[PDB]
Design a binder for these strands. Structure first.
Ligand SMILES: [K+]
Ligand SMILES: [K+]
Ligand SMILES: [K+]
Ligand SMILES: [K+]
Ligand SMILES: [K+]
Ligand SMILES: [K+]
Ligand SMILES: [K+]
Ligand SMILES: [K+]
Ligand SMILES: [K+]
Ligand SMILES: [K+]
Ligand SMILES: [K+]
Ligand SMILES: [Mg+2]
Ligand SMILES: [Mg+2]
Length: 1335
RNA sequence: GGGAAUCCCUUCUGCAGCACCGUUUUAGAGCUAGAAAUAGCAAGUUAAAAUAAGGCUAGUCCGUUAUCAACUUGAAAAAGUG
DNA sequence: CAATACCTGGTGCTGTAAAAGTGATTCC
DNA sequence: CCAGGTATTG
């Protein structure tokens, strides 16, 4: 008995099928367990497992980190209250107690209900004097009087609890506050560098212009307009643009060779400026640094909108300015509405349901919704011009706690906190003693490289302590080992050397590593001249001279420099042919030039005695990112460099690690030669062996020592191994389910292993609109275009492909240097850069928007050479703006290098057929290592089971060429059918061409391969089309003579298999996990559905949650008290155990159920019912458990194959010859009556199992309404109709314009007397429990 | 076919640190005419506390990912059953 | 108890290594 | 999104 298995691995399904020698699917009698009449059942060995998507860890992590931040914020407040404890007890022994219970109702409060002062007169007086906390904050900063300790605490606590971001290092307001003074100093520096061309900045109000609430470009234009004879693209204009945050290009300003775009926000600016300063001189550095200072001032003026010389609390002053203008404008608006529109006053100022001022303050209306609601009202009335200006500036009737307050740095809150402490420490000695303590409470951050401050009970922590004691913000440096913690943070993420698994890899920017990379590449360079007989390698002396003369003097070494600066200058060659490198060398000594600029001692870098020191420096600059820790580690070399050099070394940092260790590169030595790997790379006679040759040479000891160095740790389990793979967790869930399906199928076949296992993995193509808008915004900003000014776009609109391409191309044609019209996109074309006939790629990375695809050139290749000559520079602009990627740019410019060759097209077709994805190889490896476990006489693996991997295109083309069409919406059988067709096609393919095993089975001329792989699947066809020819009906193997395909009997077999109505569709039952309930904190309500947010917070007084998630239902057979007499009555019902209740219920099910009300619980009759638990009722009607009180549809509609194929062809689902198109069209019109037959089949099914009378009546009326509609559109909407009958949760669907709402099964009473069905993973093994025999 | 280093890119995964809102109950004395529903007006911007119930291991830690038919034997781990 | 219509926490930033999709140089 | 919970109206 021989058989094969076909598998279709998906993100929500695993289709499976068993086939025999004749491509038939067996059928078996399987035993049925339980308490029903049926002892066994007939099963076809084909089916599909269904399961909810496996989720990533991201949402769990985000909630975990947020939980920590809430705990630590509370701890900050606890620290501050602990500092205030004694003196506050002297002042008010219950102040902190009243704060703690502020949330409680007056009934539940143990102290007076007014928090601050404990009586109503003082509380009202306080609010009258300080209507916002910012009034109190500014008063405490400015005043010299002794203040109430409670108000001091409230100000300090408010600053500490909401302390602001930490994006800026160091201290703030260092005379970089004034915009006028820094603009004047920028003019001073510019006029100093350009005496002949000075700027008259007199009368220019730099403060109001630059700090205006306007866009960056508008303010740039406004300032430049105040400077006659200066243009915005000039040098001073570009400096102002850099200060405003734009991306100016200083290339044209200095007649520079290539671009020097500068952005003060980019990570590369520190280098991007120095690089520019290397070309035009270091006397322009003062100018760019003055512009940077101006940028800091403008950023601060965005937040502080008040003069900083009248108060030391400019933030609180700005909030008070918000409050005062809110008050003034509200009084004016009330008066205006009273006078002009008196009927609208109640709706605006009293209706919380409306988005007026009432909904803005009391309702759920946001500032944006309030502005949208009141803008037409202000436009309708008179005297609203200033209010309208404030509205369109987003600065009308503002609150103080708003969404944009994220701009506020923590240094500003710190400045006010420090000022209050300086004020009040003169009266309270404990404030003087604890001033720095409180400041540390606000400023302290747990470093990202330290992680949770755990003590052996967090699987996420890595921190190590210097002493065993509680960590506080004040003892962190003493208790926490920051060096070891940060080193562990990196070393727990980095790989070891795979050749020497106990050795750490080098820093990627290490000098030794870059030497290795350069010599490895350079050792395979060859050159020829005239008198030479053949190309020769470079000798050790030649490579040493090239390194010293070229690589150590240029950051990049081009081939031109190699031919001219070495072969001409040294070897006196006028002509030389180079191989092994193209255009320029890939490897380079970048760190060497970085350190050469920093330390300015070439002899220090070239001295080998300093190698260790330099390696350690680069390690310190790579291993750490905190500048203080870098300085602490570079301390040990302070004697070797000037303090200026030490500071410049501090500022330099690197990221990333190499893939080889120092011991491998320059440590281990060959036994007989005594030379390291790097020694052989520098000089290896005339062989010039590279790294791969060195470690694989049997005449050297490198290979032997690498073999000896290998180890193998603890073997992962199957689940662990699958989890460690690289890929989406969703596909990993399918992979593990696939392995369990294979194990059960093998057990079904009597532990006999299959001949083949054919796997096919679905292409994984699956907020995102936010990423699209971020790309377009940054690309347009880098580009300097005003396309977003002229054409504003909502992020959602970018989901349209043509509009997204339009913005990515800056509103221009990609093939013609013309503007596109945004209202003409329907008339334009989306073109594939490489044609879809070669590369089936429909992503934005292979698509462009053009007026007409004809303008690309010839359709058989890439864009023509003419188009590339026209558009290459515009493409490079788009590439630098990241509006197109590097691969997209290279595919566009491919015509420069010869376009598509015949080898490229052959490779494209091979890629379309042969699967090369790494995750699919890992799945094949897993199955192969589980099936094949024995070795032969030569100690080589015996491959009893061939693991074949196919791409989806093979079976897809097989279905479309032999009319085995699929329609996904009909049912779930197509997953199983795909697995079957995979097994058939895969086995037949390797039977016909056994030499293909290397390509398709796991384990160890261009026109010819193009033709061969284009016609690889022709052996299935009988007639193949000026090349029309026939094939035998019987296809056999050429050498063995074995039959592989009988075109007269095997197609009928495939058709019979797809026609079988019994297919084992199994929905994976799963306990529900995750959030306890909806997160919405609802208002109080007289409902038992509300859930307390805290133990003592009665939701009838405080509100809370509702809508909890049922982890799993439980069948309870017991008795409950009834009536006022509490008489016991027998019941059988479903109790949903929520996620929150699960732990308590499982700890003691009997006591849990008795608490719920049940008495005398039959403990052994408790049935655990997870979601999707399957029940069968009458006439084969099945239901699945959706929760404790709702059901899902549990049946599949096995629509016959003739109707499925008719629906495919009639609906134009997905062509071929026009004669074949005519035959299919004639078939559709000759079988038009299939529409009524399909509707009748849906009706019989629905009346038998769906039981939705109203929806079925609406559907029948809708079908009988649109019978004069075209056949194609009727078929397309019949496709929609199957939502009524689909397995699973009910959903709404549209038939033409008629909308059918979902009929829900809002009761689980009937399943309590039905038959519960427990299914194995394949559904072949069943246990059926008659629940009517319970109770 | 499988694999390695480098160059130019892109994406996915995992982890850590942090900010701004939102919501919720309470506090911010509403007034006048009414015996009452109600009418006329005044007012509104702020704060406290919670932000999974909670847990023991008591840490400035942990609490939403992964994994799960049934039955037999087991505390579980598991294996076994057609 | 059924049927109907509403509801559903969100945004921004910093740091990090790794596999893997794809183009290229050199090799096992 | 999807699809289970909830109150309102029957
Ligand atoms: K889930
Ligand atoms: K009380
Ligand atoms: K001007
Ligand atoms: K609101
Ligand atoms: K190159
Ligand atoms: K670093
Ligand atoms: K020194
Ligand atoms: K789960
Ligand atoms: K109130
Ligand atoms: K199951
Ligand atoms: K990341
Ligand atoms: Mg908590
Ligand atoms: Mg808030």
């Amino acid at each position: 008995k021989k058989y094969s298995i076909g598998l279709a691995i998906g993100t929500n399904s695993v289709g499976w099928a068993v086939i025999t020698d004749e491509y038939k699917v067996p059928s078996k009698k399987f035993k049925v367990l339980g308490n029903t009449d049926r002892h066994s059942i007939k099963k076809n060995l084909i089916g599909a497992l269904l399961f909810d998507s496996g989720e990533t860890a991201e949402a769990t992590r985000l909630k975990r980190t947020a939980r920590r931040r809430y705990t630590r914020r509370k701890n900050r407040i606890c620290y501050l209250q602990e500092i205030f404890s004694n003196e506050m007890a002297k002042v008010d022994d219950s102040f902190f107690h009243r704060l703690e219970e502020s949330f409680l109702v007056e009934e539940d409060k143990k102290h007076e209900r007014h928090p601050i002062f404990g009586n109503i007169v003082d509380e009202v007086a306080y609010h009258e004097k300080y209507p916002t906390i910012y009034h109190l904050r500014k008063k405490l900063v400015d005043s010299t009087d002794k203040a109430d300790l409670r108000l001091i605490y409230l100000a300090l606590a408010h600053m500490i609890k909401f302390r602001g971001h930490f994006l800026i290092e160091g201290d703030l307001n260092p005379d970089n506050s004034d915009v006028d003074k820094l603009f004047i100093q920028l003019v001073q520096t510019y006029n100093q560098l350009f005496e002949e061309n000075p700027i008259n900045a007199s009368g220019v109000d730099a403060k109001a212009i630059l700090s205006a609430r306007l866009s960056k470009s508008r303010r740039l234009e406004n300032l430049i307009a105040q400077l006659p004879g200066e243009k915005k693209n000039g040098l001073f204009g570009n400096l102002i643009a850099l200060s405003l945050g734009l991306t100016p290009n200083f290339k044209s300003n200095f007649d520079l060779a290539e671009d020097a775009k500068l952005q003060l926000s980019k990570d590369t600016y520190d280098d991007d400026l120095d690089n520019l300063l290397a070309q035009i001189g270091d006397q322009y550095a003062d100018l760019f640094l003055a512009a940077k200072n101006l940028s800091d001032a403008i950023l601060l003026s965005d937040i502080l909108r008040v003069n900083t010389e009248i108060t030391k609390a400019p933030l609180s002053a700005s909030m008070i300015k918000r409050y005062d203008e809110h008050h003034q404008d509200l009084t004016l608006l009330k008066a205006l509405v009273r006078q002009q529109l008196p009927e609208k006053y109640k709706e605006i100022f009293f209706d919380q349901s409306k988005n007026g001022y009432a909904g803005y303050i009391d309702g759920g209306a946001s500032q944006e919704e309030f502005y949208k609601f009141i803008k037409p009202i202000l436009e309708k009335m008179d005297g609203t011009e200033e209010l309208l200006v404030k509205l369109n500036r987003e600065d009308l009737l503002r609150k103080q706690r708003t969404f944009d307050n994220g701009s506020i740095p923590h240094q500003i809150h710190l400045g006010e906190l420090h000022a209050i402490l300086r004020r009040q420490e003169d009266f309270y000695p404990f404030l003087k003693d604890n001033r720095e303590k409180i400041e540390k409470i606000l400023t302290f951050r747990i470093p990202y490289y330290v992680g949770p401050l755990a003590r052996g009970n967090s699987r996420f922590a890595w921190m190590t302590r210097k002493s065993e004691e509680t960590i506080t913000p004040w003892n962190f440096e003493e208790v926490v080992d920051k060096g070891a913690s940060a080193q562990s943070f990196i070393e727990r993420m980095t790989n070891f050397d795979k050749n020497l698994p106990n050795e750490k890899v080098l820093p990627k920017h290490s000098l030794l590593y870059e030497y290795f990379t350069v010599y490895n590449e350079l050792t395979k360079v060859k050159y020829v001249t005239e008198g030479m007989r053949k190309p020769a390698f470079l000798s050790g002396e030649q490579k040493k001279a090239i390194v010293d003369l070229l690589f150590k003097t240029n950051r990049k070494v081009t081939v031109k420099q190699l031919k001219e600066d070495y072969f001409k200058k040294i070897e006196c060659f006028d002509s030389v042919e180079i191989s092994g490198v193209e255009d320029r060398f890939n490897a380079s000594l970048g760190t060497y030039h970085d350190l050469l600029k920093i330390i300015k001692d070439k002899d220090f870098l070239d001295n080998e005695e300093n190698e260790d020191i330099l390696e350690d420096i680069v390690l310190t600059l790579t291993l750490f990112e905190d500048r203080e820790m870098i300085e602490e580690r570079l301390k040990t070399y302070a004697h070797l460099f000037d303090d200026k050099v030490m500071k410049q070394l501090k500022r330099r940092r690197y990221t990333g690690w190499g893939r080889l260790s120092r011991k491998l590169i320059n440590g281990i030595r060959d036994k007989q030669s005594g030379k390291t790997i790097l020694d052989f790379l520098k000089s290896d006679g005339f062989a010039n062996r590279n790294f791969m040759q060195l470690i694989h040479d049997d005449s050297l000891t490198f290979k032997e020592d690498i073999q000896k160095a290998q180890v193998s740790g603890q073997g992962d389990s199957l689940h662990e191994h699958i989890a460690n793979l690289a890929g989406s967790p969703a596909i990993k869930k399918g992979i593990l389910q696939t392995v369990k399906v294979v194990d059960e199928l093998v057990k079904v076949m009597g532990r006999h292993k299959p001949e083949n296992i054919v796997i096919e993995m679905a292409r994984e193509n699956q907020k995102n609109s936010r990423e699209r808008m971020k790309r377009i915004e940054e690309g347009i900003k880098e580009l300097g275009s005003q396309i977003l000014k002229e054409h504003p776009v909502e992020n959602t609109q970018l989901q349209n492909e043509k509009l997204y391409l339009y913005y990515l191309q800056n509103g221009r044609d990609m093939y013609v240097d013309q503007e596109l019209d945004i209202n003409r996109l329907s008339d334009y074309d989306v073109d594939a850069i490489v044609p879809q006939s070669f590369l089936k790629d429909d992503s934005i990375d292979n698509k462009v928007l053009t007026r007409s695809d004809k303008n690309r050139g010839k359709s058989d290749n890439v864009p023509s050479e003419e188009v590339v000559k026209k558009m290459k520079n515009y493409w490079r602009q788009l590439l630098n703006a990241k509006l197109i990627t590097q691969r997209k740019f290279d595919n566009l410019t491919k015509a420069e290098r010869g376009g598509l060759s015949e080898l490229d097209k052959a490779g494209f077709i091979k890629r379309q057929l042969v699967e090369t994805r790494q995750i699919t190889k890992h799945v094949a490896q897993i199955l192969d290592s589980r099936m094949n476990t024995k070795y032969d006489e030569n100690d080589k693996l015996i491959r009893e089971v061939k693991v074949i991997t196919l791409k989806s295109k093979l079976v897809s083309d097989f279905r479309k060429d032999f009319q085995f069409y699929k329609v996904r919406e009909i049912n779930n059988y197509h997953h199983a059918h795909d697995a079957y067709l995979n097994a058939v096609v895969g086995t037949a393919l390797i039977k016909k061409y056994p030499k293909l095993e290397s390509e398709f089975v796991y384990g160890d001329k261009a026109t010819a391969k193009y033709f061969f792989y284009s016609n690889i699947m022709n052996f299935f066809k009988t007639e193949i089309t000026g090349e029309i020819r026939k094939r035998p009906l019987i296809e056999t193997n050429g050498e063995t003579g074995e039959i592989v395909w009988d075109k007269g009997r095997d197609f009928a077999t495939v058709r019979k298999v797809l026609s079988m109505p019994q297919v084992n569709i199994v929905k994976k039952t799963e306990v529900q996990t995750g959030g306890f309930s909806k997160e919405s904190i609802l208002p109080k309500r007289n409902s038992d559905k509300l859930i307390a947010r805290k133990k003592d917070w009665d939701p009838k007084k405080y509100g809370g949650f509702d809508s909890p998630t049922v982890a799993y239902s439980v069948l309870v057979v017991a008795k409950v008290e009834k009536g006022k007499s509490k008489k016991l009555k027998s019941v059988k019902e479903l109790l949903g155990i929520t996620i929150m209740e699960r732990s308590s219920f499982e700890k003691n099910p009997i006591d849990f159920l008795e608490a719920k009300g049940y008495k005398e619980v039959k403990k052994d009759l408790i049935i655990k019912l997870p979601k999707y638990s399957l029940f069968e009722l009458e006439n084969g009607r099945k239901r699945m458990l959706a929760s404790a009180g709702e059901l899902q549809k549990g049946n599949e509609l096995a629509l016959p194959s003739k109707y499925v194929n008719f629906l495919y062809l009639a609906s134009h689902y997905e062509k071929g010859s026009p004669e074949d198109n005519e035959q299919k069209q004639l078939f559709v019109e000759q079988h038009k009556h299939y529409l009524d037959e399909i509707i009748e089949q849906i009706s019989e099914f629905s009346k038998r199992v769906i039981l939705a009378d109203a929806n079925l009546d609406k559907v029948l009326s809708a079908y009988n309404k649109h019978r004069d509609k075209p056949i194609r559109e009727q078929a397309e909407n019949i496709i929609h109709l199957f939502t009524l009958t689909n397995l699973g949760a009910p959903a709404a669907f549209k038939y033409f314009d008629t909308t059918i709402d979902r009929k829900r099964y809002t009761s689980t009473k009937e399943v309590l007397d039905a038959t519960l069905i427990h299914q194995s993973i394949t559904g072949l093994y069943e246990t059926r429990i008659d629940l009517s025999q319970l109770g």
